[PDB]
PDB file of all heavy atoms in Angstrom:
ATOM      1  N   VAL A   1       7.602  -2.034  -2.271  1.00  0.00           N
ATOM      2  CA  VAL A   1       7.193  -0.711  -2.736  1.00  0.00           C
ATOM      3  C   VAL A   1       7.954  -0.401  -4.008  1.00  0.00           C
ATOM      4  O   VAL A   1       9.168  -0.536  -4.020  1.00  0.00           O
ATOM      5  CB  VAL A   1       7.547   0.395  -1.702  1.00  0.00           C
ATOM      6  CG1 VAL A   1       7.137   1.777  -2.242  1.00  0.00           C
ATOM      7  CG2 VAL A   1       6.875   0.114  -0.366  1.00  0.00           C
ATOM      8  N   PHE A   2       7.245   0.026  -5.053  1.00  0.00           N
ATOM      9  CA  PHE A   2       7.907   0.558  -6.237  1.00  0.00           C
ATOM     10  C   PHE A   2       8.277   1.999  -5.949  1.00  0.00           C
ATOM     11  O   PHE A   2       7.461   2.908  -6.179  1.00  0.00           O
ATOM     12  CB  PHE A   2       7.019   0.433  -7.465  1.00  0.00           C
ATOM     13  CG  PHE A   2       6.962  -0.976  -7.999  1.00  0.00           C
ATOM     14  CD1 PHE A   2       5.825  -1.761  -7.828  1.00  0.00           C
ATOM     15  CD2 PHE A   2       8.063  -1.514  -8.656  1.00  0.00           C
ATOM     16  CE1 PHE A   2       5.777  -3.066  -8.331  1.00  0.00           C
ATOM     17  CE2 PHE A   2       8.025  -2.810  -9.160  1.00  0.00           C
ATOM     18  CZ  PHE A   2       6.885  -3.587  -8.988  1.00  0.00           C
ATOM     19  N   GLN A   3       9.485   2.184  -5.422  1.00  0.00           N
ATOM     20  CA  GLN A   3      10.019   3.509  -5.017  1.00  0.00           C
ATOM     21  C   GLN A   3      10.506   4.279  -6.250  1.00  0.00           C
ATOM     22  O   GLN A   3      11.714   4.400  -6.481  1.00  0.00           O
ATOM     23  CB  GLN A   3      11.190   3.274  -4.061  1.00  0.00           C
ATOM     24  CG  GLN A   3      11.411   4.345  -3.033  1.00  0.00           C
ATOM     25  CD  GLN A   3      10.232   4.505  -2.064  1.00  0.00           C
ATOM     26  OE1 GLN A   3       9.964   3.636  -1.219  1.00  0.00           O
ATOM     27  NE2 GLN A   3       9.582   5.647  -2.142  1.00  0.00           N
ATOM     28  N   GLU A   4       9.565   4.788  -7.037  1.00  0.00           N
ATOM     29  CA  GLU A   4       9.905   5.488  -8.287  1.00  0.00           C
ATOM     30  C   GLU A   4      10.318   6.942  -8.009  1.00  0.00           C
ATOM     31  O   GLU A   4      10.780   7.641  -8.898  1.00  0.00           O
ATOM     32  CB  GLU A   4       8.759   5.387  -9.306  1.00  0.00           C
ATOM     33  CG  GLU A   4       8.278   3.943  -9.462  1.00  0.00           C
ATOM     34  CD  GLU A   4       7.558   3.603 -10.758  1.00  0.00           C
ATOM     35  OE1 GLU A   4       7.446   4.445 -11.681  1.00  0.00           O
ATOM     36  OE2 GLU A   4       7.090   2.441 -10.854  1.00  0.00           O
ATOM     37  N   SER A   5      10.148   7.355  -6.762  1.00  0.00           N
ATOM     38  CA  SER A   5      10.419   8.709  -6.291  1.00  0.00           C
ATOM     39  C   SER A   5      10.460   8.591  -4.770  1.00  0.00           C
ATOM     40  O   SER A   5      10.013   7.576  -4.205  1.00  0.00           O
ATOM     41  CB  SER A   5       9.290   9.662  -6.744  1.00  0.00           C
ATOM     42  OG  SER A   5       9.318  10.906  -6.077  1.00  0.00           O
ATOM     43  N   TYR A   6      10.975   9.635  -4.118  1.00  0.00           N
ATOM     44  CA  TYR A   6      10.855   9.794  -2.668  1.00  0.00           C
ATOM     45  C   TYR A   6      10.040  11.050  -2.286  1.00  0.00           C
ATOM     46  O   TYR A   6      10.003  11.463  -1.119  1.00  0.00           O
ATOM     47  CB  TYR A   6      12.245   9.844  -2.029  1.00  0.00           C
ATOM     48  CG  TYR A   6      12.987   8.536  -2.132  1.00  0.00           C
ATOM     49  CD1 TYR A   6      13.818   8.270  -3.217  1.00  0.00           C
ATOM     50  CD2 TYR A   6      12.823   7.541  -1.172  1.00  0.00           C
ATOM     51  CE1 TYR A   6      14.487   7.059  -3.343  1.00  0.00           C
ATOM     52  CE2 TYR A   6      13.479   6.335  -1.276  1.00  0.00           C
ATOM     53  CZ  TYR A   6      14.318   6.086  -2.367  1.00  0.00           C
ATOM     54  OH  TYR A   6      14.987   4.881  -2.477  1.00  0.00           O
ATOM     55  N   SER A   7       9.379  11.635  -3.280  1.00  0.00           N
ATOM     56  CA  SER A   7       8.630  12.881  -3.104  1.00  0.00           C
ATOM     57  C   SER A   7       7.274  12.695  -2.407  1.00  0.00           C
ATOM     58  O   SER A   7       6.521  11.763  -2.713  1.00  0.00           O
ATOM     59  CB  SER A   7       8.424  13.571  -4.459  1.00  0.00           C
ATOM     60  OG  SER A   7       7.623  14.746  -4.329  1.00  0.00           O
ATOM     61  N   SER A   8       6.970  13.618  -1.490  1.00  0.00           N
ATOM     62  CA  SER A   8       5.652  13.683  -0.859  1.00  0.00           C
ATOM     63  C   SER A   8       4.542  14.059  -1.854  1.00  0.00           C
ATOM     64  O   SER A   8       3.359  13.911  -1.551  1.00  0.00           O
ATOM     65  CB  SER A   8       5.678  14.671   0.317  1.00  0.00           C
ATOM     66  OG  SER A   8       5.790  16.004  -0.153  1.00  0.00           O
ATOM     67  N   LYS A   9       4.928  14.522  -3.043  1.00  0.00           N
ATOM     68  CA  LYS A   9       3.964  14.939  -4.064  1.00  0.00           C
ATOM     69  C   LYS A   9       3.631  13.848  -5.083  1.00  0.00           C
ATOM     70  O   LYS A   9       2.871  14.082  -6.025  1.00  0.00           O
ATOM     71  CB  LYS A   9       4.469  16.187  -4.802  1.00  0.00           C
ATOM     72  CG  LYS A   9       4.382  17.470  -3.986  1.00  0.00           C
ATOM     73  CD  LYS A   9       5.630  17.693  -3.139  1.00  0.00           C
ATOM     74  CE  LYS A   9       5.473  18.896  -2.213  1.00  0.00           C
ATOM     75  NZ  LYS A   9       5.248  20.168  -2.972  1.00  0.00           N
ATOM     76  N   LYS A  10       4.206  12.660  -4.894  1.00  0.00           N
ATOM     77  CA  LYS A  10       4.043  11.561  -5.841  1.00  0.00           C
ATOM     78  C   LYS A  10       3.515  10.320  -5.116  1.00  0.00           C
ATOM     79  O   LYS A  10       3.725  10.160  -3.902  1.00  0.00           O
ATOM     80  CB  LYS A  10       5.384  11.222  -6.500  1.00  0.00           C
ATOM     81  CG  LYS A  10       5.964  12.303  -7.433  1.00  0.00           C
ATOM     82  CD  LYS A  10       5.390  12.207  -8.839  1.00  0.00           C
ATOM     83  CE  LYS A  10       6.293  12.862  -9.883  1.00  0.00           C
ATOM     84  NZ  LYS A  10       6.629  14.259  -9.539  1.00  0.00           N
ATOM     85  N   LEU A  11       2.844   9.452  -5.876  1.00  0.00           N
ATOM     86  CA  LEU A  11       2.276   8.218  -5.335  1.00  0.00           C
ATOM     87  C   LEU A  11       3.051   7.014  -5.840  1.00  0.00           C
ATOM     88  O   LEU A  11       3.361   6.937  -7.016  1.00  0.00           O
ATOM     89  CB  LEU A  11       0.799   8.086  -5.725  1.00  0.00           C
ATOM     90  CG  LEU A  11      -0.153   9.163  -5.195  1.00  0.00           C
ATOM     91  CD1 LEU A  11      -1.529   9.041  -5.859  1.00  0.00           C
ATOM     92  CD2 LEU A  11      -0.260   9.100  -3.665  1.00  0.00           C
ATOM     93  N   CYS A  12       3.348   6.083  -4.936  1.00  0.00           N
ATOM     94  CA  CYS A  12       4.158   4.900  -5.229  1.00  0.00           C
ATOM     95  C   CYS A  12       3.320   3.627  -5.106  1.00  0.00           C
ATOM     96  O   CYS A  12       2.609   3.451  -4.122  1.00  0.00           O
ATOM     97  CB  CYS A  12       5.352   4.847  -4.276  1.00  0.00           C
ATOM     98  SG  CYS A  12       6.720   5.926  -4.824  1.00  0.00           S
ATOM     99  N   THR A  13       3.414   2.766  -6.114  1.00  0.00           N
ATOM    100  CA  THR A  13       2.591   1.535  -6.199  1.00  0.00           C
ATOM    101  C   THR A  13       3.243   0.415  -5.388  1.00  0.00           C
ATOM    102  O   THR A  13       4.463   0.355  -5.280  1.00  0.00           O
ATOM    103  CB  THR A  13       2.428   1.093  -7.680  1.00  0.00           C
ATOM    104  OG1 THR A  13       1.672   2.094  -8.381  1.00  0.00           O
ATOM    105  CG2 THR A  13       1.520  -0.143  -7.801  1.00  0.00           C
ATOM    106  N   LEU A  14       2.413  -0.442  -4.800  1.00  0.00           N
ATOM    107  CA  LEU A  14       2.909  -1.622  -4.070  1.00  0.00           C
ATOM    108  C   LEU A  14       2.833  -2.887  -4.913  1.00  0.00           C
ATOM    109  O   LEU A  14       1.912  -3.054  -5.703  1.00  0.00           O
ATOM    110  CB  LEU A  14       2.133  -1.832  -2.760  1.00  0.00           C
ATOM    111  CG  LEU A  14       2.040  -0.628  -1.800  1.00  0.00           C
ATOM    112  CD1 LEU A  14       1.421  -1.065  -0.469  1.00  0.00           C
ATOM    113  CD2 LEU A  14       3.353   0.070  -1.553  1.00  0.00           C
ATOM    114  N   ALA A  15       3.794  -3.782  -4.709  1.00  0.00           N
ATOM    115  CA  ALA A  15       3.888  -5.035  -5.460  1.00  0.00           C
ATOM    116  C   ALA A  15       3.064  -6.148  -4.809  1.00  0.00           C
ATOM    117  O   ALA A  15       3.483  -7.308  -4.746  1.00  0.00           O
ATOM    118  CB  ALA A  15       5.346  -5.449  -5.547  1.00  0.00           C
ATOM    119  N   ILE A  16       1.918  -5.740  -4.269  1.00  0.00           N
ATOM    120  CA  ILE A  16       0.951  -6.615  -3.579  1.00  0.00           C
ATOM    121  C   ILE A  16      -0.414  -6.179  -4.099  1.00  0.00           C
ATOM    122  O   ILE A  16      -0.746  -4.970  -4.064  1.00  0.00           O
ATOM    123  CB  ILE A  16       1.023  -6.423  -2.052  1.00  0.00           C
ATOM    124  CG1 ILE A  16       2.413  -6.820  -1.525  1.00  0.00           C
ATOM    125  CG2 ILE A  16      -0.091  -7.238  -1.377  1.00  0.00           C
ATOM    126  CD1 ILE A  16       2.710  -6.455  -0.048  1.00  0.00           C
ATOM    127  N   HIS A  17      -1.192  -7.132  -4.608  1.00  0.00           N
ATOM    128  CA  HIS A  17      -2.482  -6.818  -5.212  1.00  0.00           C
ATOM    129  C   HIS A  17      -3.546  -7.767  -4.674  1.00  0.00           C
ATOM    130  O   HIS A  17      -3.233  -8.822  -4.094  1.00  0.00           O
ATOM    131  CB  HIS A  17      -2.434  -6.917  -6.742  1.00  0.00           C
ATOM    132  CG  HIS A  17      -1.607  -5.854  -7.399  1.00  0.00           C
ATOM    133  ND1 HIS A  17      -2.137  -4.941  -8.285  1.00  0.00           N
ATOM    134  CD2 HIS A  17      -0.284  -5.572  -7.316  1.00  0.00           C
ATOM    135  CE1 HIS A  17      -1.178  -4.136  -8.714  1.00  0.00           C
ATOM    136  NE2 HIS A  17      -0.045  -4.498  -8.142  1.00  0.00           N
ATOM    137  N   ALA A  18      -4.801  -7.382  -4.865  1.00  0.00           N
ATOM    138  CA  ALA A  18      -5.899  -8.291  -4.577  1.00  0.00           C
ATOM    139  C   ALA A  18      -6.181  -9.165  -5.793  1.00  0.00           C
ATOM    140  O   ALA A  18      -6.195  -8.690  -6.935  1.00  0.00           O
ATOM    141  CB  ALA A  18      -7.154  -7.535  -4.154  1.00  0.00           C
ATOM    142  N   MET A  19      -6.389 -10.449  -5.540  1.00  0.00           N
ATOM    143  CA  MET A  19      -6.863 -11.359  -6.569  1.00  0.00           C
ATOM    144  C   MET A  19      -7.701 -12.444  -5.914  1.00  0.00           C
ATOM    145  O   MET A  19      -7.228 -13.170  -5.038  1.00  0.00           O
ATOM    146  CB  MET A  19      -5.694 -11.971  -7.331  1.00  0.00           C
ATOM    147  CG  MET A  19      -6.095 -13.024  -8.335  1.00  0.00           C
ATOM    148  SD  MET A  19      -4.827 -13.507  -9.538  1.00  0.00           S
ATOM    149  CE  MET A  19      -3.367 -12.588  -9.039  1.00  0.00           C
ATOM    150  N   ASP A  20      -8.948 -12.551  -6.338  1.00  0.00           N
ATOM    151  CA  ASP A  20      -9.803 -13.606  -5.811  1.00  0.00           C
ATOM    152  C   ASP A  20      -9.719 -14.788  -6.758  1.00  0.00           C
ATOM    153  O   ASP A  20     -10.318 -14.796  -7.837  1.00  0.00           O
ATOM    154  CB  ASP A  20     -11.245 -13.125  -5.612  1.00  0.00           C
ATOM    155  CG  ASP A  20     -11.343 -11.999  -4.607  1.00  0.00           C
ATOM    156  OD1 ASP A  20     -10.973 -12.192  -3.430  1.00  0.00           O
ATOM    157  OD2 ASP A  20     -11.787 -10.877  -4.916  1.00  0.00           O
ATOM    158  N   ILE A  21      -8.899 -15.754  -6.369  1.00  0.00           N
ATOM    159  CA  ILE A  21      -8.693 -16.947  -7.164  1.00  0.00           C
ATOM    160  C   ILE A  21      -9.823 -17.915  -6.809  1.00  0.00           C
ATOM    161  O   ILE A  21     -10.037 -18.218  -5.642  1.00  0.00           O
ATOM    162  CB  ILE A  21      -7.300 -17.530  -6.884  1.00  0.00           C
ATOM    163  CG1 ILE A  21      -6.219 -16.517  -7.294  1.00  0.00           C
ATOM    164  CG2 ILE A  21      -7.114 -18.865  -7.610  1.00  0.00           C
ATOM    165  CD1 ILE A  21      -4.833 -16.803  -6.737  1.00  0.00           C
ATOM    166  N   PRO A  22     -10.580 -18.339  -7.812  1.00  0.00           N
ATOM    167  CA  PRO A  22     -11.727 -19.225  -7.594  1.00  0.00           C
ATOM    168  C   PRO A  22     -11.314 -20.672  -7.297  1.00  0.00           C
ATOM    169  O   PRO A  22     -10.187 -21.056  -7.602  1.00  0.00           O
ATOM    170  CB  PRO A  22     -12.483 -19.158  -8.927  1.00  0.00           C
ATOM    171  CG  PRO A  22     -11.835 -18.057  -9.706  1.00  0.00           C
ATOM    172  CD  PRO A  22     -10.416 -17.990  -9.234  1.00  0.00           C
ATOM    173  N   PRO A  23     -12.205 -21.456  -6.682  1.00  0.00           N
ATOM    174  CA  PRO A  23     -12.037 -22.915  -6.619  1.00  0.00           C
ATOM    175  C   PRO A  23     -11.752 -23.514  -8.002  1.00  0.00           C
ATOM    176  O   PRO A  23     -12.134 -22.914  -9.017  1.00  0.00           O
ATOM    177  CB  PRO A  23     -13.392 -23.395  -6.097  1.00  0.00           C
ATOM    178  CG  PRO A  23     -13.880 -22.264  -5.254  1.00  0.00           C
ATOM    179  CD  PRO A  23     -13.415 -21.012  -5.960  1.00  0.00           C
ATOM    180  N   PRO A  24     -11.087 -24.672  -8.055  1.00  0.00           N
ATOM    181  CA  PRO A  24     -10.699 -25.442  -6.859  1.00  0.00           C
ATOM    182  C   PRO A  24      -9.500 -24.865  -6.096  1.00  0.00           C
ATOM    183  O   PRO A  24      -9.463 -24.937  -4.865  1.00  0.00           O
ATOM    184  CB  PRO A  24     -10.359 -26.823  -7.429  1.00  0.00           C
ATOM    185  CG  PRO A  24      -9.902 -26.552  -8.844  1.00  0.00           C
ATOM    186  CD  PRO A  24     -10.659 -25.329  -9.308  1.00  0.00           C
ATOM    187  N   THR A  25      -8.545 -24.288  -6.822  1.00  0.00           N
ATOM    188  CA  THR A  25      -7.290 -23.808  -6.226  1.00  0.00           C
ATOM    189  C   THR A  25      -7.459 -22.679  -5.183  1.00  0.00           C
ATOM    190  O   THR A  25      -6.861 -22.737  -4.107  1.00  0.00           O
ATOM    191  CB  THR A  25      -6.223 -23.489  -7.338  1.00  0.00           C
ATOM    192  OG1 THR A  25      -5.128 -22.748  -6.784  1.00  0.00           O
ATOM    193  CG2 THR A  25      -6.778 -22.561  -8.412  1.00  0.00           C
ATOM    194  N   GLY A  26      -8.297 -21.687  -5.483  1.00  0.00           N
ATOM    195  CA  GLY A  26      -8.615 -20.627  -4.513  1.00  0.00           C
ATOM    196  C   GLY A  26      -9.886 -20.897  -3.709  1.00  0.00           C
ATOM    197  O   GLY A  26     -10.580 -21.876  -3.993  1.00  0.00           O
ATOM    198  N   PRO A  27     -10.223 -20.040  -2.732  1.00  0.00           N
ATOM    199  CA  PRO A  27      -9.468 -18.818  -2.416  1.00  0.00           C
ATOM    200  C   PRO A  27      -8.117 -19.125  -1.809  1.00  0.00           C
ATOM    201  O   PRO A  27      -7.963 -20.093  -1.080  1.00  0.00           O
ATOM    202  CB  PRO A  27     -10.354 -18.115  -1.375  1.00  0.00           C
ATOM    203  CG  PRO A  27     -11.726 -18.730  -1.577  1.00  0.00           C
ATOM    204  CD  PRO A  27     -11.397 -20.184  -1.848  1.00  0.00           C
ATOM    205  N   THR A  28      -7.136 -18.290  -2.123  1.00  0.00           N
ATOM    206  CA  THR A  28      -5.768 -18.552  -1.708  1.00  0.00           C
ATOM    207  C   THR A  28      -4.935 -17.270  -1.869  1.00  0.00           C
ATOM    208  O   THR A  28      -5.289 -16.405  -2.670  1.00  0.00           O
ATOM    209  CB  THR A  28      -5.159 -19.697  -2.562  1.00  0.00           C
ATOM    210  OG1 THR A  28      -3.808 -19.927  -2.152  1.00  0.00           O
ATOM    211  CG2 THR A  28      -5.075 -19.326  -4.059  1.00  0.00           C
ATOM    212  N   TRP A  29      -3.869 -17.140  -1.089  1.00  0.00           N
ATOM    213  CA  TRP A  29      -2.831 -16.167  -1.439  1.00  0.00           C
ATOM    214  C   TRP A  29      -2.012 -16.749  -2.584  1.00  0.00           C
ATOM    215  O   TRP A  29      -1.989 -17.979  -2.792  1.00  0.00           O
ATOM    216  CB  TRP A  29      -1.896 -15.920  -0.262  1.00  0.00           C
ATOM    217  CG  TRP A  29      -2.520 -15.226   0.916  1.00  0.00           C
ATOM    218  CD1 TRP A  29      -3.412 -15.761   1.812  1.00  0.00           C
ATOM    219  CD2 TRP A  29      -2.279 -13.874   1.357  1.00  0.00           C
ATOM    220  NE1 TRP A  29      -3.739 -14.827   2.766  1.00  0.00           N
ATOM    221  CE2 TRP A  29      -3.061 -13.662   2.516  1.00  0.00           C
ATOM    222  CE3 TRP A  29      -1.479 -12.816   0.889  1.00  0.00           C
ATOM    223  CZ2 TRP A  29      -3.075 -12.439   3.210  1.00  0.00           C
ATOM    224  CZ3 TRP A  29      -1.502 -11.594   1.576  1.00  0.00           C
ATOM    225  CH2 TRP A  29      -2.287 -11.427   2.733  1.00  0.00           C
ATOM    226  N   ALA A  30      -1.316 -15.877  -3.316  1.00  0.00           N
ATOM    227  CA  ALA A  30      -0.360 -16.341  -4.325  1.00  0.00           C
ATOM    228  C   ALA A  30       0.943 -15.592  -4.093  1.00  0.00           C
ATOM    229  O   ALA A  30       0.938 -14.387  -3.933  1.00  0.00           O
ATOM    230  CB  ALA A  30      -0.889 -16.105  -5.720  1.00  0.00           C
ATOM    231  N   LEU A  31       2.043 -16.327  -4.015  1.00  0.00           N
ATOM    232  CA  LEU A  31       3.332 -15.734  -3.793  1.00  0.00           C
ATOM    233  C   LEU A  31       4.033 -15.726  -5.148  1.00  0.00           C
ATOM    234  O   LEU A  31       4.500 -16.769  -5.623  1.00  0.00           O
ATOM    235  CB  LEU A  31       4.126 -16.566  -2.777  1.00  0.00           C
ATOM    236  CG  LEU A  31       3.508 -16.721  -1.377  1.00  0.00           C
ATOM    237  CD1 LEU A  31       4.368 -17.639  -0.525  1.00  0.00           C
ATOM    238  CD2 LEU A  31       3.386 -15.385  -0.667  1.00  0.00           C
ATOM    239  N   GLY A  32       4.064 -14.564  -5.784  1.00  0.00           N
ATOM    240  CA  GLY A  32       4.614 -14.425  -7.151  1.00  0.00           C
ATOM    241  C   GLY A  32       6.005 -13.825  -7.075  1.00  0.00           C
ATOM    242  O   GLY A  32       6.735 -13.982  -6.089  1.00  0.00           O
ATOM    243  N   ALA A  33       6.396 -13.131  -8.146  1.00  0.00           N
ATOM    244  CA  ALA A  33       7.752 -12.600  -8.211  1.00  0.00           C
ATOM    245  C   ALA A  33       8.168 -11.715  -7.033  1.00  0.00           C
ATOM    246  O   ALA A  33       9.343 -11.687  -6.667  1.00  0.00           O
ATOM    247  CB  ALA A  33       7.948 -11.835  -9.558  1.00  0.00           C
ATOM    248  N   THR A  34       7.232 -10.952  -6.466  1.00  0.00           N
ATOM    249  CA  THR A  34       7.589 -10.138  -5.301  1.00  0.00           C
ATOM    250  C   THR A  34       8.263 -10.990  -4.224  1.00  0.00           C
ATOM    251  O   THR A  34       9.220 -10.576  -3.570  1.00  0.00           O
ATOM    252  CB  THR A  34       6.337  -9.492  -4.721  1.00  0.00           C
ATOM    253  OG1 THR A  34       5.736  -8.689  -5.746  1.00  0.00           O
ATOM    254  CG2 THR A  34       6.650  -8.508  -3.586  1.00  0.00           C
ATOM    255  N   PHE A  35       7.733 -12.191  -4.045  1.00  0.00           N
ATOM    256  CA  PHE A  35       8.239 -13.093  -3.003  1.00  0.00           C
ATOM    257  C   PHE A  35       9.467 -13.827  -3.497  1.00  0.00           C
ATOM    258  O   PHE A  35      10.470 -13.949  -2.788  1.00  0.00           O
ATOM    259  CB  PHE A  35       7.154 -14.086  -2.620  1.00  0.00           C
ATOM    260  CG  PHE A  35       7.514 -14.929  -1.422  1.00  0.00           C
ATOM    261  CD1 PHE A  35       7.256 -14.467  -0.142  1.00  0.00           C
ATOM    262  CD2 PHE A  35       8.108 -16.171  -1.579  1.00  0.00           C
ATOM    263  CE1 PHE A  35       7.575 -15.231   0.973  1.00  0.00           C
ATOM    264  CE2 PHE A  35       8.449 -16.953  -0.464  1.00  0.00           C
ATOM    265  CZ  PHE A  35       8.170 -16.483   0.811  1.00  0.00           C
ATOM    266  N   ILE A  36       9.396 -14.299  -4.746  1.00  0.00           N
ATOM    267  CA  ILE A  36      10.475 -15.133  -5.270  1.00  0.00           C
ATOM    268  C   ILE A  36      11.809 -14.387  -5.462  1.00  0.00           C
ATOM    269  O   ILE A  36      12.907 -14.994  -5.282  1.00  0.00           O
ATOM    270  CB  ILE A  36      10.004 -15.811  -6.549  1.00  0.00           C
ATOM    271  CG1 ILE A  36       8.837 -16.741  -6.216  1.00  0.00           C
ATOM    272  CG2 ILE A  36      11.153 -16.541  -7.222  1.00  0.00           C
ATOM    273  CD1 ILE A  36       8.052 -17.173  -7.414  1.00  0.00           C
ATOM    274  N   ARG A  37      11.735 -13.092  -5.779  1.00  0.00           N
ATOM    275  CA  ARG A  37      12.958 -12.253  -5.829  1.00  0.00           C
ATOM    276  C   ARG A  37      13.772 -12.360  -4.552  1.00  0.00           C
ATOM    277  O   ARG A  37      14.995 -12.409  -4.603  1.00  0.00           O
ATOM    278  CB  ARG A  37      12.646 -10.775  -6.033  1.00  0.00           C
ATOM    279  CG  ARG A  37      12.447 -10.331  -7.438  1.00  0.00           C
ATOM    280  CD  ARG A  37      12.435  -8.817  -7.515  1.00  0.00           C
ATOM    281  NE  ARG A  37      11.189  -8.262  -7.027  1.00  0.00           N
ATOM    282  CZ  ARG A  37      10.097  -8.166  -7.755  1.00  0.00           C
ATOM    283  NH1 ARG A  37      10.070  -8.633  -9.000  1.00  0.00           N
ATOM    284  NH2 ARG A  37       9.002  -7.595  -7.255  1.00  0.00           N
ATOM    285  N   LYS A  38      13.096 -12.374  -3.411  1.00  0.00           N
ATOM    286  CA  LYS A  38      13.810 -12.436  -2.148  1.00  0.00           C
ATOM    287  C   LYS A  38      14.200 -13.855  -1.776  1.00  0.00           C
ATOM    288  O   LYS A  38      15.272 -14.055  -1.196  1.00  0.00           O
ATOM    289  CB  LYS A  38      12.974 -11.832  -1.032  1.00  0.00           C
ATOM    290  CG  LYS A  38      13.821 -11.684   0.239  1.00  0.00           C
ATOM    291  CD  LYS A  38      13.242 -10.701   1.198  1.00  0.00           C
ATOM    292  CE  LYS A  38      14.302 -10.271   2.186  1.00  0.00           C
ATOM    293  NZ  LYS A  38      13.776  -9.207   3.087  1.00  0.00           N
ATOM    294  N   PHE A  39      13.321 -14.812  -2.097  1.00  0.00           N
ATOM    295  CA  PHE A  39      13.556 -16.214  -1.734  1.00  0.00           C
ATOM    296  C   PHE A  39      13.633 -17.130  -2.945  1.00  0.00           C
ATOM    297  O   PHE A  39      12.617 -17.429  -3.580  1.00  0.00           O
ATOM    298  CB  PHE A  39      12.472 -16.677  -0.762  1.00  0.00           C
ATOM    299  CG  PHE A  39      12.406 -15.814   0.475  1.00  0.00           C
ATOM    300  CD1 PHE A  39      11.354 -14.909   0.661  1.00  0.00           C
ATOM    301  CD2 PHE A  39      13.428 -15.872   1.418  1.00  0.00           C
ATOM    302  CE1 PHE A  39      11.317 -14.080   1.774  1.00  0.00           C
ATOM    303  CE2 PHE A  39      13.391 -15.052   2.544  1.00  0.00           C
ATOM    304  CZ  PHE A  39      12.331 -14.148   2.705  1.00  0.00           C
TER     305      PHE A  39
END
């Protein structure tokens, strides 16, 4: 979660998005920086 605020009056963006990766490689999940920061 991009915790840019803790206010009930504001909306916070998630670091998870939809992407339809075409063949040959997709369809697939992609583990980008959100994942690599932790691991």
